[PDB]
Amino acid sequence: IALDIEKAKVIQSSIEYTTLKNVTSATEIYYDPDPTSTVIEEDFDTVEAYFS
Amino acid sequence: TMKEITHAISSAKEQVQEIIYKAQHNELELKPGMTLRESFEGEVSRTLNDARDSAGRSAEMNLKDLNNVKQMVSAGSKGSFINIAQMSACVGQQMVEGKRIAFGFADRSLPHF
Amino acid sequence: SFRFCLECNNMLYPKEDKENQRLLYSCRNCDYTELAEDPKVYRHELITNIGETAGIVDDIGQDPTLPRSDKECPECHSRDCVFFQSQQRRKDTNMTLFYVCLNCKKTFRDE
Numbered sequence: 449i450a451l452d453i454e455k456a457k458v459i460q461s462s463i464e465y466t467t468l469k470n471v472t473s474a475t476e477i478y479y480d481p482d483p484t485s486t487v488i489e490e491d492f493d494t495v496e497a498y499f500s
Numbered sequence: 501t502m503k504e505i506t507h508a509i510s511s512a513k514e515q516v517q518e519i520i521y522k523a524q525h526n527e528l529e530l531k532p533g534m535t536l537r538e539s540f541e542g543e544v545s546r547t548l549n550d551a552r553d554s555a556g557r558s559a560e561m562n563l564k565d566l567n568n569v570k571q572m573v574s575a576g577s578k579g580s581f582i583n584i585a586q587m588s589a590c591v592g593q594q595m596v597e598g599k600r601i602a603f604g605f606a607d608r609s610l611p612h613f
Numbered sequence: 614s615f616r617f618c619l620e621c622n623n624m625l626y627p628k629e630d631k632e633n634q635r636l637l638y639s640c641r642n643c644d645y646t647e648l649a650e651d652p653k654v655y656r657h658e659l660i661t662n663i664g665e666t667a668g669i670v671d672d673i674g675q676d677p678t679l680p681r682s683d684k685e686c687p688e689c690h691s692r693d694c695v696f697f698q699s700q701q702r703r704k705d706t707n708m709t710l711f712y713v714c715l716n717c718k719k720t721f722r723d724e
């Protein structure tokens with residue numbers, strides 16, 4: 449690992465601390481009274497694909 | 501030698517201008533573990549330090565053996581290379597708290613800029 | 614953005630009906646209740662870019678301490694302009710420039 453850069457980078461990634469807040473960009477709260485469907489149109493396709 | 505020193509300082513200032521343009525167009529490489537502003541400041545400071553060292557080296561190479569400052573520096577009794585550089589070629593960059601002169605006014609160092 | 618009560622000017626907190634399954638903005642100081650238009654109750658930006666270009670005034674061309682360039686205006690193609698960096702002053706802030714024309718007074722970049 450000391451003479452190889454890729455394995456060293458793998459070890460570095462495995463050591464460094466990473467929280468959810470680091471990768472998160474924005475969080476939102478929405479009102480949706482239908483458990484099996486949704487009001488948002490952008491995500492409607494993906495969630496209906498999941499449920500089906 | 502004064503022509504050579506002036507050319508070195510002008511080339512360094514042109515290099516600093518290029519670094520400024522690159523940082524102002526998002527074309528600057530970021531030193532790991534440091535922000536964009538910190539990397540820009542460090543790179544400009546390194547360029548200016550290299551400029552002063554090059555000008556001083558030119559000035560110190562110019563000196564004859566009969567030069568008295570050279571004789572004192574070569575004896576090791578008083579003075580060094582930086583003294584010759586600042587006396588003859590360039591004083592260099594002034595650092596306050598390990599950084600260049602801050603913006604004590606509103607986004608400038610003096611009301612003349 | 615949050616709305617205010619139309620009768621006693623207090624804040625309209627969101628409320629949910631168990632029987633009707635609707636989102637309603639209701640004032641807690643009275644019985645007023647108005648139907649909500651959007652379900653976006655709350656939004657938090659961990660990394661935000663607001664205030665970077667929001668610090669702009671219409672009289673910035675009269676400041677004599679600002680540098681003057683000759684960049685081309687995208688709208689009226691003027692030959693004089695005034696530039697400055699980002700008004701946000703965090704440590705992560707970019708060093709990009711914002712140019713202001715002396716005729717249309719709009720803010721535009723160089724990219």
Ligand SMILES: [Zn+2]
Nearest residue numbers: 618621640643
């Ligand atoms: Zn009310």
Ligand SMILES: [Zn+2]
Nearest residue numbers: 686689714717
């Ligand atoms: Zn214009």
